[PDB]
Amino acid sequence: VKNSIIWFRKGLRLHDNPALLEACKDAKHVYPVFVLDPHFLQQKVSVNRYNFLLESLEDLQRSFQARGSRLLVLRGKPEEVFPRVFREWGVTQLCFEHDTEPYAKVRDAAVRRLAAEAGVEVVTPISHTLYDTDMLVARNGGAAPLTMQSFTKLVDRVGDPPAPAPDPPAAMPPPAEDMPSAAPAATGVPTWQEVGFKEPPLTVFKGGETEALARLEAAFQDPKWVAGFQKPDTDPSAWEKPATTVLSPYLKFGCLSARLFHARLLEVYRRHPAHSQPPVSLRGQLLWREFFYTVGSTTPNFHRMAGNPVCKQIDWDDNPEFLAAWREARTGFPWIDAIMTQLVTWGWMHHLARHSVACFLTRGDLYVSWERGMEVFEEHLIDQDHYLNAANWMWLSASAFFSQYFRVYSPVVFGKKYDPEGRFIRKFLPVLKDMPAKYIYEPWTAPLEVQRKAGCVVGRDYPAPIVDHAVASKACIARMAAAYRRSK
Ligand SMILES: Cc1cc2nc3c(=O)[nH]c(=O)nc-3n(C[C@H](O)[C@H](O)[C@H](O)COP(=O)(O)OP(=O)(O)OC[C@H]3O[C@@H](n4cnc5c(N)ncnc54)[C@H](O)[C@@H]3O)c2cc1C
Numbered sequence: 001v002k003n004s005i006i007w008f009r010k011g012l013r014l015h016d017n018p019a020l021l022e023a024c025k026d027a028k029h030v031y032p033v034f035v036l037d038p039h040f041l042q043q044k045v046s047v048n049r050y051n052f053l054l055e056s057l058e059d060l061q062r063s064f065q066a067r068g069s070r071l072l073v074l075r076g077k078p079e080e081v082f083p084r085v086f087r088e089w090g091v092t093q094l095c096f097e098h099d100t101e102p103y104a105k106v107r108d109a110a111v112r113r114l115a116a117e118a119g120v121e122v123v124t125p126i127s128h129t130l131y132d133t134d135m136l137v138a139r140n141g142g143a144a145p146l147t148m149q150s151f152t153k154l155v156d157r158v159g160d161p162p163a164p165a166p167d168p169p170a171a172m173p174p175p176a177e178d179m180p181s182a183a184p185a186a187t188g189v190p191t192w193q194e195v196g197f198k199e200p201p202l203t204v205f206k207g208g209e210t211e212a213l214a215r216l217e218a219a220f221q222d223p224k225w226v227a228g229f230q231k232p233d234t235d236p237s238a239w240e241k242p243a244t245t246v247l248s249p250y251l252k253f254g255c256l257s258a259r260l261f262h263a264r265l266l267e268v269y270r271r272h273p274a275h276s277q278p279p280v281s282l283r284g285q286l287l288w289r290e291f292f293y294t295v296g297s298t299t300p301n302f303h304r305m306a307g308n309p310v311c312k313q314i315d316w317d318d319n320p321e322f323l324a325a326w327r328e329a330r331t332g333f334p335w336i337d338a339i340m341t342q343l344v345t346w347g348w349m350h351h352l353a354r355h356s357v358a359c360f361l362t363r364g365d366l367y368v369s370w371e372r373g374m375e376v377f378e379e380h381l382i383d384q385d386h387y388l389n390a391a392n393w394m395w396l397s398a399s400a401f402f403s404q405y406f407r408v409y410s411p412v413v414f415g416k417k418y419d420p421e422g423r424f425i426r427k428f429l430p431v432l433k434d435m436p437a438k439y440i441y442e443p444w445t446a447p448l449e450v451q452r453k454a455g456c457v458v459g460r461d462y463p464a465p466i467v468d469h470a471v472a473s474k475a476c477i478a479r480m481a482a483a484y485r486r487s488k
């Protein structure tokens, strides 16, 4: 008799899940498993992202219950729980999606060793990325492309990515009954209060495959907008209706198939011959994701500076005071402080909004290491991706992929081009709601009578700017220029 385990780590969905389809094939009992460590906080992670994970697990639970099954949330470490459930459940096959992150390679190699001792077959298909990333490297002569131009030319030679896998059957083989490790009281999905958090999440994006597909269809309600999508032209100040899809948290956890996303993009492109082309198209944005996954997975110490063969060694300053003001959104620049407040409130900001805060902290004004601001992003971002977070921080700090350090965003003028009235600032910084638009981006320039009238006196209700952007940016550009000559 065949008894299988479908192990969820990423790929928290039922659609386009070849690991789930194999586990259900000729199976008498299937055990949907998610391994949860009950001591994760007692050792980092915000309640926004972690509750986003729990909502994604609750969505899988209701989907498995509608097919006669049930999701098992096991507590402990995979190295300690799986050797037990192999014998207890009589497992003959273990299936899970392939992951290329550093911790996953150490973890999955250990579990495969344990599965071989128990005589369990291991099937690990590829469906988190568009292509087999090792195949793309081998097709390129054994090395990953280091530019988007060459990378886009590589995938065009390989062809279309595999089509998404079909849906699982309407009825699944349920877990065996009266199994001690599958007791419902020990395998349920916990709430955010039970895992240890004390403050409630404030984000407006709900997790789960159902919400991911609902947001996918909403983006495709206007095929003209999908075909003519151009990433650099979108509005970072739009918050009532974000200018992009905001599918990043669902692609990070696997709530949405990247291959299903790509398949729907090609259907619209076929009926719109003037559609946008990479790297600015919507398909191009999925290729940025695939590109950073390909380079990051084959580069040692990608997430760091030292020992990173692609990251330039810059003598970033160790200034805890500048980092603290930037982290706590008290820089004195309302454009930056509002974006950082959106980071801690929603866990998601627009791409160009992330450019503004990352440039200001690194090569723009404060000259703080990109590793420090990234630890802040890894804490609060609900779409936090090990490879995408690191690769884009090296981009904005002019350490890798990007080298035009003479391009420095202004924390005053940038947002004013989109939102001259400062509506975005007034939403996330309510202390400036009564400030006139002439001074909403430069509140320290307002006369004292205006500050009093608006109920926002600089230095009392809102902090003064920590630096002079004209003075700070010139010093950073001179130091970046001296760093690019000492490389060679
Ligand atoms: C400093 C910095 C840190 C970032 N950290 C992350 C991160 O941890 N997780 C993350 O998903 N993205 C990250 N990005 C990329 C980008 O900010 C987001 O992917 C994007 O803002 C998400 O909104 P969206 O889903 O509407 O994007 P869309 O424009 O709708 O793009 C569609 C999808 O393509 C991918 N994508 C888009 N732009 C990029 C990009 N520049 N690089 C890689 N993939 C991209 C994402 O999966 C996204 O969901 C970072 C960018 C910067 C500048």
Ligand SMILES: [Cl-]
Pocket (backbone or CB within 6 Å): 408, 409, 410, 413, 414
């Ligand atoms: Cl600018």
